[PDB]
Write a protein that binds this ligand. Structure first.
Ligand code: HEM
Ligand SMILES: [Fe+2]
Length: 153
């Protein structure tokens, strides 16, 4: 459970994000792939972009990240009251794409890293801290849902 102050910082920085969902989406995916190329393998139609310029200019990849960041931002805005939208996501991620919880840390890392790099002044220690707290709540709660549907994190 996050303090009201922590939630405010989360949605403060995220408002920043919303000034360019697509661009942030791209840099997070690129960050993520580079740090952990096993990640790119679950992303089966993005498997074949070989460079970041290729990655950047791919509409498909682009739109993909918007879809993703938009779902994530809607979840953050519920300030933890989010089972109604955590459910369809864990369902497709648990029993389809088959994304292990470790992969959710990986992307949480990329997220923190990308936010800091673009919004340092709005992403100091308190803010950084809050976002971690939020994303660890997200990963706690989706793990719980992963188990309810069979096969774990
Ligand atoms: C903040 C964490 C992320 C969120 C909220 C999330 C959300 C979403 C959403 C909303 C979609 C589109 C509909 C659906 O399939 O549910 C999706 C698709 C997908 N997600 Fe995630 N994503 C997250 C993490 C990622 C990561 C970490 C991976 C791989 C390591 C993964 C792989 C995929 C794949 C492979 C698709 C299908 C794309 C296809 O159409 O080609 N997810 N995700
Ligand atoms: Fe993705």
């Amino acid at each position: 459970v996050l303090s009201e102050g922590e939630w405010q910082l989360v949605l403060h920085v995220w408002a920043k994000v919303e000034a360019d969902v697509a661009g942030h989406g791209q840099d997070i995916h690129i960050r993520l792939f580079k740090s952990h190329p096993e990640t790119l393998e679950k992303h089966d139609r993005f498997k074949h972009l070989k460079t970041e310029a290729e990655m950047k200019a791919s509409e498909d990849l682009k739109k993909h990240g918007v879809t993703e960041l938009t779902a994530l931002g809607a979840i953050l805005k519920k300030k933890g009251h989010h089972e109604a939208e955590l459910k369809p996501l864990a369902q497709s991620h648990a029993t389809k794409h088959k994304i292990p919880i470790k992969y959710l840390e990986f992307i949480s890392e990329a997220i923190i890293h990308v936010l800091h790099s673009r919004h340092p002044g709005d992403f100091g220690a308190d803010a950084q801290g809050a976002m971690n707290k939020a994303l660890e709540l997200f990963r706690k709660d989706i793990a719980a849902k992963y188990k309810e549907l069979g096969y774990q994190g």
